[PDB]
Amino acid sequence: KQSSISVAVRVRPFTEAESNRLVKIDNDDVGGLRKIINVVDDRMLIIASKRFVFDRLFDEDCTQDQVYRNTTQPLLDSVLDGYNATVFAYGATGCGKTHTISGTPEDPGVIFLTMKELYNRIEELKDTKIIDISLSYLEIYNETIRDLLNPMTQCKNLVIREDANNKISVSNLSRHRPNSVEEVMQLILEGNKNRTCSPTEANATSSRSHAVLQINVIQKDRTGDITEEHTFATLSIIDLAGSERAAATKNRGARLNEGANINKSLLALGNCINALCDPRRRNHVPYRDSKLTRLLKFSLGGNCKTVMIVCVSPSSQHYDETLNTLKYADRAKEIKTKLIRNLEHH
Amino acid sequence: MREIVHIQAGQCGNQIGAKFWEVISDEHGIDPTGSYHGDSDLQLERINVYYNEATGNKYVPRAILVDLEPGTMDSVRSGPFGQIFRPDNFVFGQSGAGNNWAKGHYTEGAELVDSVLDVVRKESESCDCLQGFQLTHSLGGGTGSGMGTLLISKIREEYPDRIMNTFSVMPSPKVSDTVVEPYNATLSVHQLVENTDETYCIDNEALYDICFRTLKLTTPTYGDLNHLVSATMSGVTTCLRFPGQLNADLRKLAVNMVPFPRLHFFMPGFAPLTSRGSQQYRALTVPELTQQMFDSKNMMAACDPRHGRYLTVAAIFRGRMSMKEVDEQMLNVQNKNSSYFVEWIPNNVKTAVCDIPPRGLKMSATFIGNSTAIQELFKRISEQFTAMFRRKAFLHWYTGEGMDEMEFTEAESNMNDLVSEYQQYQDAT
Amino acid sequence: MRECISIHVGQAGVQIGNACWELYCLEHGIQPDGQMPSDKTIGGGDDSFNTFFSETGAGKHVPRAVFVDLEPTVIDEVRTGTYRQLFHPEQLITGKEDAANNYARGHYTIGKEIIDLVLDRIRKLADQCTGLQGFLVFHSFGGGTGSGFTSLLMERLSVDYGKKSKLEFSIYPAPQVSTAVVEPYNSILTTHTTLEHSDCAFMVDNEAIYDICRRNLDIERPTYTNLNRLISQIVSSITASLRFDGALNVDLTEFQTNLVPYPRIHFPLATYAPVISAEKAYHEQLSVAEITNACFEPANQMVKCDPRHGKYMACCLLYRGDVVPKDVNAAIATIKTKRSIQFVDWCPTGFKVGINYQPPTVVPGGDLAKVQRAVCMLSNTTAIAEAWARLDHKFDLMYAKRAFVHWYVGEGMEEGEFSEAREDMAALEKDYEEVGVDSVE
Ligand SMILES: CC(=O)O[C@H]1C(=O)[C@@]2(C)[C@H]([C@H](OC(=O)c3ccccc3)[C@]3(O)C[C@H](OC(=O)[C@H](O)[C@@H](NC(=O)c4ccccc4)c4ccccc4)C(C)=C1C3(C)C)[C@]1(OC(C)=O)CO[C@@H]1C[C@@H]2O
Ligand SMILES: Nc1nc2c(ncn2[C@@H]2O[C@H](COP(=O)(O)OP(=O)(O)OP(=O)(O)O)[C@@H](O)[C@H]2O)c(=O)[nH]1
Ligand SMILES: Nc1ncnc2c1ncn2[C@@H]1O[C@H](COP(=O)(O)OP(=O)(O)NP(=O)(O)O)[C@@H](O)[C@H]1O
Ligand SMILES: Nc1nc2c(ncn2[C@@H]2O[C@H](COP(=O)(O)OP(=O)(O)O)[C@@H](O)[C@H]2O)c(=O)[nH]1
Ligand SMILES: [Mg+2]
Ligand SMILES: [Mg+2]
């Protein structure tokens, strides 16, 4: 019993500053530079001199409904029916990773839509079986775990541990049991408000911490059945930080340390993906290099499937790290995973 | 202006530090009083790396002593070089650790580390530029294995971008001294793997073998062992406080020896070492030094190099010598013993040279290696751990102080992961 | 009027500069104190020429140099040594911490805290000169500072100056000998960043000089002082055309229009023929033909390469001492007919000749012998394409497993910058195969 890992690609539309120069300067020939990506079809992809294949790609004019319908349905259906499934974003600064995964109140992202559909499915299946949910929300920053729902707890007490079964479990994690969509919107908004970010730069929406939302779904029978239909499941949405080069930031203070830790974590994730993809490096996968890859131990290839959403840009300046993202996506697509049912209480 | 802050935790660390400062004062020409009676100018040009200047041409070591029982501090104070240390950093408690890691890390250590951190801050803020820290401790006892790790974690939290070093006396394979060595060793390694940057593993049995065979000493006391450790402790910074043809600092050796962040456990060594009645039958040259260094009999850790492969090796030479000789000899060593070296690193050797040798020798050489064979040491503990953990032999003394079984399982898992990590690169290509 | 600024970076640069300025002081009669008693012999002399030294009204001669290094261990030895009164006290030190063999620290993290002083001193020295003819930057691939800081300084100088010449002197890594595990990474990043800022980057290999010292000079235990002295002799031979007079003087700006056919291929080799000790100075003639033949032998190359596995693209021979043009023409005619020394089919001329009347100097306590005449050959050839390839083979082995990469990314770099630095180098290799195939019609 095995499943398949999934990879998808998204690209943003030109910003105002670059689009203005594009209409002024470069439009005459056809800094507002030329279109490198030039998406050729829905599934394949072309770049300046090469060609690759990913799954269900999206153009700059794509809509939230299309991406939600093209990435989340297998994960949603599996998670509701036990199993396990996750989604995580990847890319570089300014590629729009926090817009697709979270979104705004007027441009909602994958979290809002997928959790609202979970609530609707719970309402629909209420006549059949009862479903309850629990939630947790954390960030990884400077090699430290922080809770975005209980900020009073210090980073000293937050630590990952595992038993002989090798199951990851965070200590003193604030597990919140909601009752309505308004409550969970309040929790999500407060968590995003308390997220660590760099408002010093003009792009104040720039994230400088890896955000992880985890939602656990449990089921229970209605009328008279005796210790049946528990069937717990877990889903996680992960928003990573960017890999901005130091060349792009002449001024360097604490932002230097933040970027160094972010880049180290991203390198650890890349090494883990490469190790999993390779056949003969399976003797050991270095999960311990960072807290991020340690927390995604089961998500990557343990007992679960995941969707890797890589975000790129059409600006010509963004070439090398986009190619790095493409290569790492290609190897992320080649890793396998297993899937098993849940425990039954008696 | 690079400088180092020294800390000493526990009996073993305190004794090794006492002998280390005794050696360094003679190297730089300082008395027990703290005045200067050197002869050369080079001894004062970089005295600020370790020492701190005082009023009347006096020099006080930048060392911080910590241990929960006052006996070792009284012994050091009564010693010959007890007056150079500032009295204000003789931080101690009254209730001992009792060879219990929990008492050193959870119960009693927490009631004394704030003063240690205050002293560390006071010493560090006086620096023009701080290179890093270095600590001496033993992984078998309670004071060392607990307070050293707690202090390392807190210093790393406060000073993230500075080098942290440890000269750890790892537990012996055969001849132990405490019944609870495996628990302390595992719980201390669980923190050292995460926090430090250069962990210099040392074993008592290797020191005894070196003393018995090479030095031909009949009754090797602990002073001789501390001397052997202090020789290497005063060699990893010789290029940082003396001139040389090819210099090297702690960060340069860290970069050229740590291919992946968790592989920072190193086996040291020192040459020349000969008997007193056999120094007139040897020619002191670079080939003799490199032969003595690379031999397994001269290693300071029990693990045999020949049971694995060298990932990265470093050699700090001291004296006047030709760089052609050094380069040729290291190339020849790599070529002849290619089975004992890793393929995906083309050149494994990092050489540094300093022009000022020790006081009474014309040439010296400090060896450091990063070998997969170190895994064997951890593997031994991973047995001696589980045999006691599968039956909870001595576990109530630890749970009564605050700890739980989750810490023990996590430490065991981390140790096994480290062993598997080394074994991956042992047989890769 | 013919002045040119010298800059030294890193331990290798500083230790080569020590020998260079010792040689210059010996040649021009300047003592280590900066004085010049040679005016006693001839009134109003100009031995301390304005090319490499600036004269004050008090009679001193301060050198035109900017010694820069991150760690305070080598510059301090100069400030304490015997040349402390020669240099301007503005020898620049960061004085905090070395680059630790990290390109990122020398480029992004620590290099940005000291570059402004370097630019200010270079601006002052440039304003002092009437017209400067170029820059001479001494460094070494493999070191953190020698890669990163050299790249940063060259980028800023190209932004500021531009059309001015910028020549390099770099110690390239040896194929087998080495003293750093992360040296291929630094070398690859350096050649990527400093391929479109330099104009002619001379290369030198330590292993080749060790072999030369073993075979010719008969020194079985050499140190870096002898290597630095040989490099000093190379640089003095190059710059002799500016300070003194000769039949054919090769200016610095004329090096480029005779050695670099295309802009990207600017990595020539340098060799010095009459390396002979005083014992074998006798029993030898040391004629022009002998030294010219010795320059083209594989054994006397200062870079570990085999010219027989490639075609010479250009050659520039700078002579010193008693040399007549007829003997040089005879030597060139003898060399051209040899079938082993091949040339590209698109360069029938091939050679450039320069002659200078001042013989080479000798440093007391050295090993080179007193020779009436000498020659230095600067040859642009395609054998260098091998030396790159070996280094590339050392890159792909390590980058495949991402070894020693966490330091670079932790000091402000992205992994992708490595891959680019490979690809560009690969393109350069292709160019050296694209400019070797014989033309057809
Ligand atoms: C004539 C001669 O060679 O004298 C040597 C000597 O005989 C031998 C046997 C010495 C001697 O060492 C020992 O016998 C010894 C005993 C216990 C543990 C270690 C060594 C010597 O004691 C050791 C001492 O070494 C030093 O002075 C070094 O500088 C050393 N410092 C100290 O030992 C020292 C100790 C206390 C107070 C002040 C200095 C050192 C080493 C590394 C880095 C820095 C300093 C010297 C010259 C000798 C004697 C005296 C016999 C040897 O020691 C060293 C470290 O050089 C052992 O073999 C080496 C080299 C020599 O062959
Ligand atoms: N020819 C010559 N080469 C040298 C000399 N000193 C060092 N090198 C070369 O320099 C290389 C490493 O760089 P280093 O000079 O040691 O130091 P660096 O280039 O300044 O880099 P940093 O460590 O950041 O200071 C070695 O591989 C040596 O071959 C020298 O005196 N003469
Ligand atoms: N497809 C899109 N269409 C329109 N606007 C977008 C799109 N994607 C992103 N944006 C906006 O562009 C801005 C920059 O994108 P943003 O989501 O901040 O990237 P990011 O992932 O946050 N960068 P980082 O902080 O490094 O992760 C955001 O304010 C987005 O709302
Ligand atoms: N080299 C050396 N090792 C020592 C010395 N004393 C104790 N040890 C080692 O340290 C371990 C005991 O640790 P200890 O110093 O008692 O720890 P503490 O009681 O918590 O301070 C033993 O396993 C010994 O091998 C010494 O004087 N020299
Ligand atoms: Mg973001
Ligand atoms: Mg240096």
Residue numbers in the entry:
A (entry chain K): 22 to 51, 100 to 116, 142 to 440
B (entry chain B): 1 to 429
C (entry chain A): 1 to 441
Please quote the paper that reports this structure.
Kinesin-8s are dual-activity motor proteins that can move processively on microtubules and depolymerize microtubule plus-ends, but their mechanism of combining these distinct activities remains unclear. The pathogenic yeast Candida albicans expresses a single kinesin-8 homolog, dubbed CaKip3, whose motor domain shares 60% sequence identity with that of S. cerevisiae Kip3. To understand the mechanistic basis for the dual-functionality of kinesin-8, we obtained seven cryo-EM structures of Candida albicans Kip3 bound to either the microtubule lattice or curved microtubule end mimics, and a microtubule-unbound CaKip3 X-ray structure. Our findings implicate loop-2 as a tubulin protofilament shape sensor that regulates conformational changes in the kinesin-8 motor domain, which can either induce curvature of protofilaments at the microtubule end, leading to microtubule depolymerization, or enable forward displacement of the neck linker for processive motility if the motor domain is bound to protofilaments in the microtubule lattice.
To investigate this hypothesis experimentally, we designed and expressed a mutant version of the CaKip3-MDN construct, whose long loop-2 was replaced with the short loop-2 sequence found in human kinesin-1, HsKIF5B (CaKip3-MDNL2-HsKHC), which does not contact α-tubulin in any of the available microtubule-bound or tubulin-bound kinesin-1 structures. In line with our hypothesis, the cryo-EM structure of this CaKip3 construct bound to microtubules has a docked neck-linker and closed nucleotide pocket in the ATP-like state (MT-CaKip3-MDNL2-HsKHC-ANP), unlike the CaKip3-MDN construct with a full loop-2 (MT-CaKip3-MDN-ANP). These data show that the kinesin-8-specific elongated loop-2 acts as a tubulin tether on the microtubule lattice pre-ATP hydrolysis, preventing the motor from closing, and that removing the CaKip3 loop-2 residues that interact with the microtubule lattice enable the motor domain to form the closed conformation in the ATP-bound state. The MT-CaKip3-MDNL2-HsKHC-ANP structure also suggests that loop-2 of kinesin-8 is directly involved in inducing tubulin curvature because the tubulin conformational changes in this structure are less extensive than in the MT-CaKip3-MDC-AAF structure (compare blue arrows on α-tubulin). While many of these interactions likely contribute to the bending of tubulin, loop-2 adds to the tubulin-curving ability of the motor. This is supported by the greater degree of α-tubulin displacement relative to β-tubulin between the MT-CaKip3-MDC-ANP and MT-CaKip3-MDC-AAF complexes than between the MT-CaKip3-MDNL2-HsKHC-APO and MT-CaKip3-MDNL2-HsKHC-ANP complexes. The gliding data shows that elimination of the CaKip3 loop-2 increased the microtubule-gliding speed of the motor by over threefold. The data from the ATPase experiments show that CaKip3-MDNL2-HsKHC is ~1.6-fold faster at hydrolyzing ATP on microtubules than CaKip3-MDN.
